[PDB]
Design an enzyme around this catalytic site. Structure first.
Site, mmCIF file in Angstrom:
data_model
loop_
_atom_site.group_PDB
_atom_site.id
_atom_site.type_symbol
_atom_site.label_atom_id
_atom_site.label_comp_id
_atom_site.label_asym_id
_atom_site.label_seq_id
_atom_site.Cartn_x
_atom_site.Cartn_y
_atom_site.Cartn_z
ATOM 1 N N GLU A 377 31.895 59.450 35.182
ATOM 2 C CA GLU A 377 30.614 60.012 35.599
ATOM 3 C C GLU A 377 29.575 59.849 34.491
ATOM 4 O O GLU A 377 29.841 60.159 33.324
ATOM 5 C CB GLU A 377 30.785 61.489 35.956
ATOM 6 C CG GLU A 377 31.543 61.708 37.262
ATOM 7 C CD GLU A 377 32.155 63.096 37.370
ATOM 8 O OE1 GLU A 377 32.012 63.892 36.420
ATOM 9 O OE2 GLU A 377 32.771 63.398 38.412
ATOM 10 N N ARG A 393 30.658 60.382 30.719
ATOM 11 C CA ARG A 393 31.928 61.081 30.606
ATOM 12 C C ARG A 393 33.011 60.117 30.147
ATOM 13 O O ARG A 393 33.201 59.046 30.735
ATOM 14 C CB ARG A 393 32.265 61.693 31.964
ATOM 15 C CG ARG A 393 33.630 62.318 32.123
ATOM 16 C CD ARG A 393 33.684 62.985 33.493
ATOM 17 N NE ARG A 393 35.007 63.466 33.881
ATOM 18 C CZ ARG A 393 35.223 64.336 34.866
ATOM 19 N NH1 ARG A 393 34.207 64.833 35.552
ATOM 20 N NH2 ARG A 393 36.458 64.715 35.160
ATOM 21 N N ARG A 457 35.626 74.753 31.117
ATOM 22 C CA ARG A 457 34.271 74.553 31.621
ATOM 23 C C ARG A 457 33.557 75.903 31.618
ATOM 24 O O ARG A 457 33.662 76.689 32.561
ATOM 25 C CB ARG A 457 34.313 73.914 32.993
ATOM 26 C CG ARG A 457 35.078 72.578 32.991
ATOM 27 C CD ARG A 457 34.968 71.850 34.302
ATOM 28 N NE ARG A 457 35.568 70.513 34.216
ATOM 29 C CZ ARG A 457 35.626 69.653 35.224
ATOM 30 N NH1 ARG A 457 35.115 69.980 36.403
ATOM 31 N NH2 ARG A 457 36.189 68.458 35.053
HETATM 32 O O1 GC9 Z 1 37.616 62.237 43.235
HETATM 33 C C1 GC9 Z 1 36.470 61.979 42.878
HETATM 34 C C2 GC9 Z 1 35.878 60.669 43.222
HETATM 35 O O2 GC9 Z 1 35.215 60.998 44.539
HETATM 36 N N1 GC9 Z 1 35.724 62.807 42.102
HETATM 37 C C3 GC9 Z 1 35.842 64.125 41.447
HETATM 38 C C4 GC9 Z 1 35.820 63.948 39.926
HETATM 39 C C5 GC9 Z 1 36.785 62.847 39.496
HETATM 40 O O3 GC9 Z 1 36.361 61.628 40.134
HETATM 41 C C6 GC9 Z 1 36.778 62.645 37.977
HETATM 42 O O4 GC9 Z 1 35.475 62.310 37.515
HETATM 43 C C7 GC9 Z 1 37.817 61.468 37.583
HETATM 44 O O5 GC9 Z 1 38.938 62.176 37.183
HETATM 45 O O6 GC9 Z 1 36.205 65.202 39.348
HETATM 46 C C8 GC9 Z 1 35.456 66.243 39.805
HETATM 47 C C9 GC9 Z 1 35.488 67.385 39.006
HETATM 48 O O7 GC9 Z 1 34.845 68.404 39.336
HETATM 49 O O8 GC9 Z 1 36.162 67.390 37.952
HETATM 50 C C10 GC9 Z 1 34.711 66.189 40.981
HETATM 51 C C11 GC9 Z 1 34.696 65.057 41.804
HETATM 52 O O9 GC9 Z 1 34.780 65.503 43.163
#
Ligand code: GC9
Length: 522
Positions: A377, A393, A457
């Site tokens: 991200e 990230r 967090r």
């Molecule tokens: O699964 C997906 C892709 O759609 N997204 C997740 C994301 C992960 O992608 C992370 O960045 C890779 O580990 O994590 C979180 C979170 O709140 O931690 C929210 C997202 O919904």
């Protein structure tokens, strides 16, 4: 003698909430029998006319094995997750001992509480009026505590000069029949309208795949009030699959400043059972194999939204497992180019962050090369004209990775602040650039927001930089939420003098707060 220990909280005071934890009190009553009253003094600048009531609650005692751990409460007093039960303190956990409505600057809360022969927990609740200003700040001190009809010694473990800021629970758990809301994005249109987007996760808080839509809250009064939720992206039973196998999530929103056209990009997952899209999206191009990158646009200041525009074919390499936007927001560069941060899991199953851009007002999009390996991200801002700064990230952990590009992602240069200046717990982070002519300080500034920690967090914090991201001075930071939460946030400028933040807080799934620019840079 017995000492009453006091811990002032540092969490948003939601205007619509019936209760807000303001102080926590611990008393180990070895020689105390009854707690009679607590006297409170609000700050000289506080507008008492915006305060609906002040209450004193008793929450009982503690487990004997937990003595000496310096806990100030036995349990969470106000839930942010229970649908329909997030506005008031849980009555089973807290006994309302006293309440003063329309209080004066000096408030006496009589308790008359028989103390448990051991640890006793009390706390003070602050309830604002529904019409309270988003920018007014609340400060208060506990002047005295009466125990057995005598002044008890106090020791305050929290710091002095705490500024309590209010906020609006734009979305609470359970609103509109949805179990949860996550992943915020926030923008300000050319007309000053605030648009906030997020995942509407109906069944639970799990990531895709699941029954998820993209919801939007629209405010025309600077975040004081928000219009009924809209759904720019929802796929229901597309392809005749269940809605829970047609979720769309992780939205990112941007405003085309040249035209005021608003764009929302998201990742639509089709099929994949009930498993997580992060390891259920696979190489290919069509809906039956890989997540689809979809857009919806608004040409009427965010009121109505177009049918989905699938641009997966334009930008995805067929060998990638998963291409999606970087949640949060995009930007419009000075030359008119639109930029969304993006991330893709490549053919080696490693995630990489980058940017995707359009030079033709969003009709066609392009991706070149990733900024850094094993990053996910990211948020992007035009720090100086023609120079895009990507804040990422990093799965290596501990700190953000920062890079810059001058050719729209063909080549990247590692920034001096990378992997040192901005700590993180591997969470999402917001970054925006505010140009001198567009803010009251007449200086180019960068605003950054995230959980200011390396583990967990919590301590959501806005940080300000005046040297293009080289330095983030401690005095230019505001800590908004000490509590534990999901950690995602997004920033915008409400006006030349005020910042807006939409984030996942300890008090609401979608929390909006307004912070004066001179509060951060004094
Ligand atoms: O699964 C997906 C892709 O759609 N997204 C997740 C994301 C992960 O992608 C992370 O960045 C890779 O580990 O994590 C979180 C979170 O709140 O931690 C929210 C997202 O919904």
């Amino acid at each position: 003698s017995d000492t009453v220990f006091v811990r002032e909280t540092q969490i948003p005071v939601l205007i619509e909430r019936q209760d807000n934890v303001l102080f926590m009190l611990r008393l180990n009553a070895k020689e105390s029998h009854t707690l009679d009253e607590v006297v409170l003094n609000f700050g000289k600048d506080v507008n008492m006319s915006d305060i609906q009531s002040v209450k004193l609650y008793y929450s009982g005692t503690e487990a004997r094995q937990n003595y000496g751990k310096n806990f100030f409460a036995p349990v969470s007093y106000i839930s942010s997750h229970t649908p329909g039960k997030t506005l008031a303190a849980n009555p089973s956990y807290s006994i309302n001992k006293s309440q003063v409505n329309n209080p004066k600057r000096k408030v006496a809360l009589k308790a008359n509480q028989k103390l448990f022969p051991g640890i006793n927990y009390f706390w003070i609740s602050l309830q604002m009026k529904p019409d309270a200003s988003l920018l007014d700040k609340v400060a208060a001190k506990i002047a005295a505590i009466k125990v057995d009809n005598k002044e008890a010694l106090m020791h305050t473990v929290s710091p002095e000069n705490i500024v309590h800021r209010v906020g609006v629970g734009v979305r609470h758990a359970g609103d509109d029949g949805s179990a949860s809301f996550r992943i915020p994005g926030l923008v300000t249109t050319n007309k000053g309208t605030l648009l906030g987007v997020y995942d509407v996760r109906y069944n639970n808080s799990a990531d895709l795949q699941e029954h998820v839509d993209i919801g939007l809250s629209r405010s025309v009064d600077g975040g004081k009030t928000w219009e009924k939720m809209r759904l720019p992206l929802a796929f229901g039973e597309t392809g005749d699959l269940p809605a829970a196998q047609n979720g769309v999530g992780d939205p990112s929103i941007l405003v085309d400043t040249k035209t005021n056209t608003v764009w929302v990009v998201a990742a639509w997952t089709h099929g994949m059972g009930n498993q997580r899209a992060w390891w259920s999206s696979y190489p290919g191009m069509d809906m039956n194999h890989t997540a689809q990158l979809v857009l919806s646009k608004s040409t009427d200041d965010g009121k109505t939204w177009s049918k989905p525009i699938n641009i997966t074919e334009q930008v995805k390499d067929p060998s990638w497992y998963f291409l999606l936007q970087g949640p949060g927001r995009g930007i419009t560069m000075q030359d008119g180019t639109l930029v969304f941060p993006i991330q893709f899991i490549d053919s080696t199953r490693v995630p990489n962050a980058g940017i995707m851009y359009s030079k033709d007002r969003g009709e066609t999009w392009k991706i070149h090369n990733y900024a850094r390996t094993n990053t996910t991200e990211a948020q992007v801002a035009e720090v100086e004209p023609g120079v895009l700064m990507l804040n990422m990230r990093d799965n290596r952990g501990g700190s953000r990775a920062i890079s810059t590009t001058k050719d729209l992602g063909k080549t990247w240069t590692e920034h001096s602040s990378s992997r040192k200046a901005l700590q993180e717990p591997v969470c999402m982070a917001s970054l925006i650039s505010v140009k001198a002519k567009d803010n009251v300080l007449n200086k180019d500034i960068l605003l950054f927001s995230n959980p200011n920690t390396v583990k967990g967090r919590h301590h959501i914090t806005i940080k300000a930089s005046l040297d293009g991201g080289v330095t983030w001075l401690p005095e230019h930071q505001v800590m908004l939420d000490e509590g534990e939460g999901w950690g995602y946030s997004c920033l915008t400028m409400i006006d030349k003098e005020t910042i807006g933040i939409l984030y996942e807080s300890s008090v609401a799934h979608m929390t909006f707060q307004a912070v004066q620019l001179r509060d951060i840079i004094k």
